[PDB]
Structures are given as C-alpha cells and as structure tokens.
Design a protein around this ligand. Structure first.
Ligand code: ADP
Ligand code: ADP
Ligand code: ADP
Ligand code: ADP
Ligand code: ADP
Ligand code: ADP
Ligand code: UDP
Ligand code: UDP
Ligand code: UDP
Ligand code: UDP
Ligand code: UDP
Ligand code: UDP
Ligand code: MG
Ligand code: MG
Ligand code: MG
Ligand code: MG
Lengths: 233, 233, 233, 233, 233, 233
C-alpha cells in the first residue's frame, strides 16, 4: 500500500442520481465504492459535502452568506447520517463526528476520539464542514486530513477525473494535468477547489489527488500506489 | 381580535413550488402571509416542518425511524433559518429557537426567552420539532402552543382547507367538517395530524383550526374572529 | 421468555413507604423486584417518576405548570440516581441517562449509547422524563420504549393491579379489565395514564401491560409469558 | 445603610412548616422576609439549601457521598425555582443561576451576568451550591459572596439566632457570642457552618453574621447597621 | 471616516514589553491605542494572538501540532480576558467571544450576538482563534472580519510597518510595498501573514492593511482615510 | 504498598527550569518522576497548577481576582495538556479531565468516568482547578482526592521537603515537623497550602503528606510506606 491513512472528500451530489435529495440507490453505490477502499485495509476518514441539498443564498430571500453556509453545514450532517447508515448496511464499522455539536444526533468532533476510531479500524465521517462559514467542505477536507494525520487528501470531485487547464464543463478544449504545484493552481485561477484548501495543504506539504471515484479501480488504485487523476504537491 | 397569541404550524412544503428544496419566491410568498397576520398585532409563534427537504427512512438504506426523525429535525432548522431571513427581509422582527442545541446557528429553545420575545412583539420560529423522534411537527406545534400560552393552534395544512371525512386527495367525494371533537377525530381515524397532537390539545382544552393559509384573508380572518376551516375542540 | 426487551415504568412513590421522600428500605425492595426481572435475562430499560418528592404547582406560589414540570423532571433525576445506587448495591450493572443534560451527574440521553448499554446487559434508567413539560413519565415511558425498541411497556401503577372501569380508590365497585383497545381507554375516559402515552403506543402498535409490581412474581410472570394485569393493545 | 450588597444564605427548611417538602405558605413567608430586605435598597444575592428535601446518603442504599451530594444540589435547584416564583408573586425582580448547567430550566452561573443582574436591582438566587460535592451551601454562600463582591455573608441559620458555645439544641447551657474570630470558631470545634466556609471567609477578610431571619426586623436591622446575631470576623 | 467597521488583528506580544507574559503597563498602553481608534466612532472587532504565552510544539515533549494549537487557543483567551479588563478600566464597553465554549469565562462565538454588540458600540474581542488547529490568528482575523462584515482587516504587525520584499528583520536591504495583490504576496513567498488568511481575503475581495500600531496616529489614520502601511487588495 | 490510590498535587513551576513557561526537558523530567510512581502499580490522579504561566491580578489592569483566577484555570489546562503529552511519549496511559468544559481539548470532569480510568490503570490529570475562583489548586487537590477516593493527598511542594515552623525560604532558622494536626497548621498560621484545602481534608480525615518530589525516591517512598516529608492528619 502506498498509503496507510487517507482523507476521502466526497461531493454531496454522490447521494443522488437526479441532482437533488438523498436517494437510497445512489447512497448504496457510494457506500460500495467506500467499502472497496476500506477492504484494502487503509484507514479511512471522510468529509462529505451537501450540493445535493443546498446551493446557497441564491435560494434565500435577504440571506447572508454566513446564514446560507450554516444551512449548508446542517445539510452535510444530514448526508453524513445517511452515508453512515448505508455503510453500516454493508457491515463496515462507521462513526460520525460533526463540527456543530448536536449531542442527540452524533458525536461532536473530538480529535482524540477520531484517532481512536481510526486506530480501531472504523471509518470516521466528518459532517458539518469546519463549523465556520466562508469555507466549503474542500477546506474541511484539508483541515480534517491534517487533524487525523492523513497522508493525502483524495478529492472525489463531481463529474471530472482530474484538474484541467479550465473548467472542462465550460470549455471542451481543456486539458488534464498529471501534476501541479499548489502555486500553479492559484496562479492559473483554477476553480476545482477552495483556494483556502490549497494553501492549507501547501503550508503542510500535504499532497492532494483529484480523481473520479466512480471509475472502477480508481480509488483502490490510488491507495495501492497507481498513478490516477491529478497530483497537487 | 379574537386571539392575542397564536401558534401557527407550517408545512415545510410551503417553501417550495416544485416538491423539493427551499425556493426564494415560495419562501417570500409565505413570509408575506405571515406578515399579514403579524400586522394585525397578534403575538405569533411558528412551528415549521421539513417535507420539502426530507421524507423519512424510505430515502435511507437500513435506516431507523429514529434516525430518519433526527434528520428531519435538522431539516426543519434549515427551513426555520430560511423563513427567518425572509421575514426579516420584510422588516418583521423574528427569532429562531431550536429543540436541538446548535449554538452558532440559533438560540436554543428556552421557555422564558421565548415568552420574552413574544412580549417584545417578535415572531418566534421553533425549529427542530420537540427534539424527540416519534413526533411530527404537529405534536411540536401542540407542545410549543402550551409552552408559550398560545390560545389556539392554527394548523396550516398543505393543500386542504379543513378536515374532511376522508383524505380529499384520494377521495373526491370527501366532505368537510365545520367542527369536530378531539375524540371524533380519533374515532373516525382521520389522518390530518398526529393523534398525539390531538390528545395533547385535548388534555388542555386547547382548540385547533385546520385551514388553508393560501386562501387570501383566511389566516387574518381566523385571528379577527371569522369562521374559517375546521375547528377541533 | 415472551419478551426480549421491555420498558418498565415506575412511580416515584415506590421509593417511599410514607408518602414523601427517598427511603433506603423502600428503594431496596424496589431494587430486589427489578433484580428478579433482570435475572430472567430480559433487557430492561426503566423510566422513573417523581411523586414521592413533588406533586406539581399546588406546592408553588404563582407557579406555571411548565415550571412545576421542570421541577418534577429534576426530581425524577434524583430518584434515578438513588435507584441506580440501590441496583448497583445488588450487583446489577446500571446506567442512568437524563433528558436534561447535567454532565457531572449522569450521562445525557443519547439513543445509541442507550442501545449499546442494553446490548451489554446493563439496565438503563431514564431520568428527566422527555425533557418537555406537559408530559408525565407515562409519555416518557412510551417514547423511550419506542426509542430503544422495547417490545412492550410495563406500567407498574401505584396501588392497582390493572386498569379498572373507574378509579378503584374512589369507586369500590370498579371492575378490572383483562384487555382493552387504545380507543377503548380514550372513549371510556379512564385516568390510568397519559392519553398522549396511549396514542403514542397506539400509533406504533406497541402494547402496554398495567400491573402491580409488588404482587410477587407478577413482573417476572409477564416477562415469561403469563397473563398478568390488563393488556392494552 | 451599612451594606450596599450582601449575600443571604437560606436554609432549605425555610420552605416548609412540617420538616419536609416545599410548601406554598412557608415559601411566601420566606419571600416576604426577603422583600423586606429588598425594599431597603440593598443589592441582594441568595444561596438556598435543601434540608427540606434531602438529608444525604443515609437515605440511599450503597450510596457514595458524592452521589448523595449531587442529589442534594438538584434539590437546591428545586427550591431556587420555587423561591423565585414566590418572589415574582410580590413583584420583586428575580433571576436564578445554577452551578449545574440545566439550560431549559435556568441560567447557568455566569459571573458577569450575575453582576449585571445585581446592578439592575434584581435578586439573584444561586441554586446548585458550588457544583462540587463535599461542600454544603454554607461554602457556596462564601464562594458566591466573593464572586459578586458582597460585603458580608448573612447566614440565616435554621432554629438559632447566633453562634453558641455549643449546639444550643443539644445543650441548654450554651451561651451566645456577640463576636468571634474565624479561628475561634475552628479551635472551639463549633458546628454552626462548614469549616471550609469559615476559612474561605477568613482568607478574604469577609465578615459573617449568623442570625434568625424570622425575628422581625433582624434582617433589615443588619442591613441598616444594627447589632444583630453573631459577627464572625 | 473611510471605514465604519474594521477588524483589528493584534499579536499577543503587545501585552508584554519583555517578550513573554501578560504585563499591566504594556496591556494598558495597548488599550490606550485601541481606545484612540474607538474614539473615532468606528465599530471595532479585535482578534488577539498568543505569542507572548505560547510558541508551539517545540515546547512540548512528543507533542503534535494540533495539541500545541489548542494550547495556543487557550492562551489567546487568557489574553482576551486581560485586554477586556484594561479596556474596561478605561471605560470602553467591551465583550469577549471565544471560539471554544467556556461558559464561565466569556460568551461563545455567536454571529448574531457579535453583530448586536458592534451595533451597540461595543468592542468585541475574539479569543480562541477559529477553534480549529492549523488555522492561525491571521486566518481567524480574516474569518471574523468576514463574519462581522468588517470593511478591512487591519493587521497590526509586531515591529514592522508594512509588507516588505523580504523579512526586514533578516534583510536590511528589503523594500516596503505601498500596495500588493493577494497573488503577489503568494508568488513572492512573503511571510507577513498566513497564506490561508491571504486566500480567504482574496476570495471575498476583503482588503488587508499591514501597519505598525505603535506608530502614533497610524491606526486612527487608516480609519480616517490616510495612506498608512501596506494595502493588500 | 502502603497506598493503593493517591492524588498527587504538582506545581505549574515543575514544567519549567526558568521560573516561567512550558519547557520540554523540565516537563520530561517531571514525567519521569511520575512514571516512577506509576510503575509501583499505584492508581494515580494528578492536579496541576499554573504558577509557571500566571501569577494573578497584579498582572492585569483593573483586573478583579475572579477574572485572574479564571485565567489561571486556563493556564492549568495548558499545563495538563503538556504533561499528558510527555507522559504519553513515555508510554504511560493518561487522560485529562478539566473543571471547565472544553470538548475539543479534553474530556469534562465526570466522576464516574474518572473512576473507570483509574481502575483501567490510567493516570488522570485534572486541569482547571475546581472551576471556581477563590478555590486554589491545593483546594482542587483536596476536592479531587475526595471525589476519586484517594487515600492521601501528596503535596509536591516547590523547593521544600515538608512543613516548617516558618517559611523556610524566609527564615533559615525554621524547623521542620514530622507530623502536625490540621488545627496546628491553622493555629500556627503556616502558609504551606490553602487553609481551605486543610479544612476540607480535616473534615474527611484525609491525610496530607508534604514532600519534595525532586528528592529521588521520595515519591516512591511515600507510596511504598516509608516516612518522607511531613504528615498532616
Ligand atoms: N480547472 C478545473 N478542473 C476540474 N474541474 C473544474 C475546474 N474548474 C472548475 N471545475 C469544476 O469543479 C467541479 C467540482 O466542483 P463542485 O461542483 O463543487 O464538485 P464537488 O461538489 O465535488 O466539489 C467540476 O464539476 C468542474 O465543473
Ligand atoms: N381527514 C382528512 N382531512 C384533510 N386532510 C387529510 C385527511 N386525512 C389525510 N389528509 C392529508 O393530510 C395532508 C396534510 O398532511 P401533511 O402533508 O403532513 O401536511 P402538513 O405538511 O401541513 O402537516 C393533507 O394534504 C391531506 O392529503
Ligand atoms: N381506570 C383506572 N384504573 C386504574 N387506576 C386508575 C384508573 N383511573 C385512575 N386511576 C388512578 O391512577 C393511579 C395511578 O396514577 P399515578 O399516581 O400517576 O400512578 P403512577 O405514579 O404509577 O403513574 C392509580 O393509583 C389509581 O388511583
Ligand atoms: N455552636 C453552634 N451555634 C449555633 N448553632 C449550632 C452550633 N453547633 C451546631 N449548631 C446547629 O446548626 C444548626 C443549623 O445548621 P443546619 O441544620 O444545617 O441549618 P441550616 O440548614 O440553616 O444550615 C442549628 O440548628 C444548630 O442546631
Ligand atoms: N515580507 C515581510 N514583510 C513584513 N514582515 C515580515 C515579512 N516576512 C516575514 N515577516 C515577519 O513577520 C513578523 C510579523 O509576524 P509576527 O511576529 O507573528 O507578528 P504577529 O504576531 O502580529 O503576526 C514581522 O515581525 C516580520 O519580522
Ligand atoms: N510553613 C511553611 N512550610 C513550608 N513551606 C512554606 C511555609 N510557609 C510558606 N511556605 C512556602 O510555600 C511554598 C510552596 O508553595 P508554592 O510555591 O505555591 O508551591 P506550589 O506551587 O507547589 O503550591 C514553599 O516554596 C515555601 O517557600
Ligand atoms: O467548512 C464548511 C463546509 C461547508 N460549508 C457550507 O456548507 C456547504 C457544503 O457543501 P459543499 O459545497 O462542501 O459540497 P459539495 O459541493 O462537495 O457537494 C458549502 O457549500 C457551504 O455553504 C461551510 O460554510 N463551511
Ligand atoms: O417533534 C418532532 C418534529 C419533527 N420530527 C421529524 O422531522 C420531520 C419534519 O417533517 P414534518 O412532517 O413535520 O413536516 P411537514 O410535513 O409539515 O412539512 C418529521 O416528519 C419527523 O421525521 C420529529 O421526529 N419530531
Ligand atoms: O416527560 C415528562 C416527565 C415528567 N414531567 C414532570 O415530572 C413529573 C414526574 O412525576 P410523575 O407523575 O411522572 O411521577 P409518578 O406519579 O409516576 O411518581 C410529572 O408529574 C411532570 O410534572 C414532565 O413534565 N414531563
Ligand atoms: O456546594 C454544595 C452545596 C450543596 N451540596 C449538597 O446539597 C445539599 C444542600 O443542602 P444544605 O445542607 O446546603 O441545606 P440547608 O441544611 O441549609 O437546608 C448539601 O447538604 C450537600 O449534600 C453539595 O454537595 N455541594
Ligand atoms: O484559529 C486559531 C488561532 C490560533 N491558534 C493557535 O494559537 C496561536 C495563537 O498565537 P499566534 O502566534 O497566532 O499569535 P501572535 O501573538 O503571533 O499574533 C497559534 O500560533 C496557534 O498555535 C490556533 O490553533 N487556531
Ligand atoms: O480551583 C482552582 C484552581 C486554580 N485557580 C486559579 O489558577 C491558579 C493555579 O495556579 P497555582 O498558583 O494555584 O498553582 P501552582 O503552580 O502554584 O501550584 C490559581 O492561582 C488561581 O488563580 C482557581 O481559580 N481555581
Ligand atoms: Mg465543493
Ligand atoms: Mg407535509
Ligand atoms: Mg404517581
Ligand atoms: Mg447547612
């Protein structure tokens, strides 16, 4: 194995086939991909987004960005709980920790508890992002990777298989990169993930792999050492 | 004014026109109805549901009913926050209290903070139901009515204008009731609301009016003393 | 064994023989009955009332019913802590969870900590009711039964051995029922328990047995499959 | 006025005429004494005991002192809430802060909030003692006096009007002291209050007056400068 | 006035003249500078660092960076409490909000409460950073600026009056910039602040002014519209 | 072994050789002494002070003693976290419980959890004192000893090997006592520890041993039954 512990960042869109909502069949498919990774023996922490449920203050009337972001963080917790149940259906031991403390619903985020969960071969799903507005779960992925000592952030990005010279769904001439420096991402103004998540990984020397989780073998390949997707380092 | 303080129970469906999501124009139209009631000078507490965002364990995989309920409670808080912004857009002073404590996002349910807010002519929106699974927001509406000393529960029901002999959406021949007793609702097995919400109001002699909030003038009518919808008492 | 997991509802009066207080010998006698049921191997959750310590707003001066209810909830936690010590005296593994969060004193109600404790053959005593005013512990017993997946609610009622046509303490001519339906309880206006607790169990098809815990063998009888008391179903 | 801000320590026994429980008439009488002090214009913080409800581990079976103390702290909060309602019945503005955080029921203890309450001419009742076992509310009285900057602790002791050379209810030859040093109290082994409360006041030079609150004029006299009871200094 | 609401980022070092500790005369001197800016009428939010009290994991034995960062977050709260007292002793109304919830000590970070405080012309001091390890006080300054709608982040740098081509206390030949872009800071590898704080401001278009707070008139100059220090925008 | 469970009170000064701060080699040296006592098999609970980081209100401007004490409580938690890391790096299983609840950083003080930890042969480090101002770490040592059922409080005094007739670093003619009573300490006006800590131990009959932890073999000596230091009993 190239990696013993990883942070897998997932789009909330992966929980539906139809753009919106939480759907059982899509959640099962996503669980099956995660179990494929779990079965390699890697230690697995996850950050889950909420694009399937909530886009932002465009949906509100007179809505601050902070308020819209809090709504989105609650949505990521909805997804976290749904994903945990799907993984438990496969018998994969799973815990959820949320960046907003909601005692009746899930454990709060507690570093020493997250570490013990990973050491006991459990998947830890992080809901709620970082708990702060003005981030996406991209930044929560970088932060939680650093907090659990993951060796790489695996960004399972919706509808792309890597980082491109441009948004490949707005420019068919876009070209995929094998490798990039953090600064190259910033200088070229690429919009594949929060620039704040880039700089957080930059400061720690934490590598990022952007890939297509629904390409069979891709996630297991990354874990086992294959070249897959785009490496930011 | 017949009533000085009312609890208004709203379906989460009122925030969308397309089945799913939170939508600006639907939320704004709902806020305008609430503003008409507020402008009468009545004191106004609201309980909001989550059916525009979450439909229960049918959407999960191997999901407890309790877990589905906690996800719904999170969804009601998302709706409460969106509704608050919409009302504040219109200049209506509004507070949100949640049955689950989420410090950054809203204040917790605290009985005499809620009493003080109503006394200060603010709308109090209660998110999170009662904080317990195995209720709907119907029972949360009954509970919160008793807690704030509301004089009646105004049940704004999605797509009906009162209580009928049968589900009017399955039975075109159903007949509307002008009045019912609590026991009559239970013995006829009508499915307009939680039977638990029925008996809570029954134990207290707290009346319920089931009505159509989008019939212009209905809500303000009830507040002023007109006969609108079905009275359960 | 007919039942694998039961919820046992206890009056706070069982902790005293003199109307008021918490008394060692009464608490110990109650703990011995609970130990007999535990020794059958059934999984056992308990909800405890507060009538030995608090009788409601009649004891206050200008006191809300909600405020009286919150005081009663505090009193149920006092009883839960006393009962736990008594059971631990007898070697019975016991946990206390409270509906109101009081960190130093007991763990908070958390649904799958409670599920894990029962799986580990510990008794879980729930203090604080549901955490909401306008319920009795009767409704808390119904709620907690549903939450832990109990198969029946065992209503140990103070000074009666079943449900009667009338209050047997006011009507010496009252007759005991072997069986009732939920609706029959409501329509006959019997005052054995919260009508809200009745309808909660009714909605779930959760049966209730009203019985005398101090009739030797009654509790263990019910657990083993004997006909004891009144079945509501 | 001799004093601008005082801490009044009250026995839980003052809430009953009959040894046990909370009784409306006794609570009103106690409220009327407190209002007499309030009407002088002094700033008034209160610590309330629980001897009317809970004595200790003698009432438990296999009961630790710590557990018995937690039960007693919950009882002081019951009394605090009852006393607040009685004072509110007289129109005296009153707040309750508890050393155990119980959000739905009362404010948590927060120093800056307690100070603002006193500055706004409200009575603050402290329930829960210090939140730590192994104290009595005597020690909570000394601690809360220091925390709010009270100039004296007024110990309204049950059934005595001062400090005596011996327990005056076990030795009719006991003599009352006008004045005592902290060390004199310790050296003579007097049992009128926690020795820990003595030393806490010793270290701060905080004077203590032990007196009979039901002697008409006594409490107002202390506040206005008269010699009443026993001074420990 | 050029700016109506600002976020002032301060080093923990400003609370000492001797490299380490909290010292009264330095804290008072810092409070007098803050009071001068308050006296312009600007709404003022502060983020305070910890360098006077804690450097990081090299002070620990086997200490991971996350643990060191939590220790520094505690230190920032220590400084916030000391700064609040100095400011209050000058009669400036001040509130402290902490990213880690410690009820007894200060109010939690709550965005709507912080907005009300600023509108009521109080200084809000933010302690605890963001509550997340791997985030710096520079990043907390950026975040809290966004959250309170400050128009600019004023980075009071220790012993430096702007951004330079190189660390000036390491290269006497370094040249100061009047103006830079966010990307210029990142590309030139400048170490004036956390790159994550840069990119957060970049994404919002929030301008940063790096300046020397102990150059008399500089802070007030920036507030009134003068050109002081270095503008990053 | 004379003692099976002890409470070890340590000064914050033991974490530095230079009067102030947290330093790795002093912290490691302190951890090696603690590990030597752990290796005897005794169950070991620790209370840690703050003097290496915070002296009190003379470091503040207009700073009341309560605020200074909360600042010191934060410092004791900083030290607890650093001590836990040094101990863990020696392979000693260690848990931290804090009197102020800071979820992200350490578990809250919970008596039943602390007992389980000691029974599972873990060191429990108590940070935050008691959570109350005006209580000292000496008083916290006494309290936490009572709460965990320690058989003795071991007061590791800074630069002193027992109790003396006078402050020895102020009177070279002072004479050491082998033994004293609680009352002798109070009557002689000795300043070795908080008088409130003395009286708390007096009331429980809990013995105190004042000793020099950096006299090699002394801590282990006390645990194995030797006569070391001064016994207060
Ligand atoms: N340079 C780029 N390379 C790859 N994807 C890009 C780039 N710029 C923008 N994108 C967009 O980023 C999207 C992923 O972002 P988002 O919709 O938020 O997915 P996720 O929810 O997985 O973060 C891709 O679908 C793509 O349209
Ligand atoms: N007897 C009845 N009278 C009226 N409506 C009924 C009755 N029985 C069932 N219903 C159905 O209940 C629906 C309201 O349920 P729900 O979707 O939960 O509304 P809400 O979301 O407002 O609570 C109505 O739209 C109607 O289809
Ligand atoms: N129909 C009935 N059958 C039995 N008991 C009844 C009935 N109606 C009222 N009761 C009264 O309800 C009491 C139980 O109420 P309560 O004191 O709350 O018991 P518990 O404390 O066990 O809930 C019985 O002692 C009885 O006096
Ligand atoms: N030396 C003493 N002087 C006065 N009262 C004493 C003394 N020693 C013991 N006491 C007892 O202390 C009692 C007050 O303590 P307690 O019953 O706890 O009252 P409270 O509940 O007000 O503290 C008095 O009723 C008295 O019996
Ligand atoms: N390009 C640069 N321009 C200005 N200062 C720099 C630069 N590179 C490094 N620094 C250093 O950054 C320091 C400011 O950071 P720091 O000491 O952490 O102050 P603060 O604690 O307020 O952030 C300056 O004292 C300076 O020595
Ligand atoms: N009678 C006494 N015997 C011993 N030490 C004393 C006495 N009186 C005062 N002290 C002082 O108390 C100090 C111990 O307290 P302190 O410095 O606070 O250590 P710690 O921080 O461990 O409590 C000793 O260093 C000593 O100088
Ligand atoms: O640290 C965080 C994480 C999330 N969010 C909000 O919650 C949403 C989570 O959705 P995200 O964009 O991360 O999901 P994805 O696009 O991958 O489905 C964000 O968009 C923000 O609105 C936030 O404010 N801070
Ligand atoms: O007290 C409550 C309130 C709500 N809920 C859950 O949250 C959902 C909220 O949706 P609801 O049916 O109340 O909304 P509506 O149908 O009125 O839009 C419920 O269905 C439950 O799953 C709950 O468990 N308890
Ligand atoms: O969910 C609950 C449970 C309890 N209580 C209050 O706490 C008291 C507990 O006494 P109960 O009647 O349940 O005890 P019992 O009569 O069984 O001894 C109730 O009366 C209410 O005042 C409440 O408000 N809600
Ligand atoms: O700081 C405190 C205050 C109270 N208690 C407990 O709660 C009871 C409160 O009753 P108290 O003796 O103070 O009341 P009084 O005798 O004045 O009625 C005590 O006896 C203890 O059991 C405690 O453990 N710590
Ligand atoms: O959001 C934050 C803010 C601060 N810190 C920690 O607390 C320290 C704050 O002191 P810093 O050196 O940033 O402040 P300065 O005094 O240098 O401005 C940081 O170094 C980190 O260790 C953190 O972990 N997260
Ligand atoms: O229960 C407690 C314990 C500690 N403290 C505060 O925290 C400091 C802890 O450091 P201390 O000087 O007591 O410890 P040392 O290092 O001297 O043993 C005290 O001085 C108080 O300011 C407090 O307020 N309450
Ligand atoms: Mg995204
Ligand atoms: Mg609906
Ligand atoms: Mg009863
Ligand atoms: Mg007492």
């Amino acid at each position: 194995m190239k990696y013993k512990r990883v942070l897998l960042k997932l789009s909330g869109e992966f929980l539906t086939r139809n753009g919106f909502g939480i759907e059982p069949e899509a959640t099962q498919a996503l669980a099956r991909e995660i179990k494929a990774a779990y079965d390699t023996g890697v230690q697995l922490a996850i950050v889950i987004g909420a694009g399937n449920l909530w886009r932002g203050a465009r949906q509100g009337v007179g809505m601050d960005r902070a308020t819209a972001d809090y709504i989105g963080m609650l949505a990521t917790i909805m997804n976290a709980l749904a994903l945990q149940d799907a993984l438990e259906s496969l018998g994969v031991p799973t815990r959820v920790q949320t960046a907003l403390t909601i005692t009746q619903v899930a454990e709060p985020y507690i570093r020493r508890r997250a570490l013990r969960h990973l050491e006991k071969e459990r998947i830890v799903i992080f809901g709620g992002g970082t708990g702060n507005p003005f981030f996406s779960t991209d930044t929560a992925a970088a932060l939680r990777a650093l907090e659990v000592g993951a060796e790489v952030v695996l960004m399972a990005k919706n509808k792309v298989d890597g980082v491109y010279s441009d948004d490949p769904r707005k420019n068919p001439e876009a070209v995929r990169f094998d490798e990039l420096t953090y600064l190259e991402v910033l200088n070229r103004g690429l919009q594949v993930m929060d620039t704040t998540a880039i700089t957080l990984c930059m400061e720690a020397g934490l590598p990022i792999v952007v890939f297509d989780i629904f390409k069979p073998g891709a996630l297991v390949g990354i874990i086992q050492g294959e070249k897959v997707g785009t490496l930011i380092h």
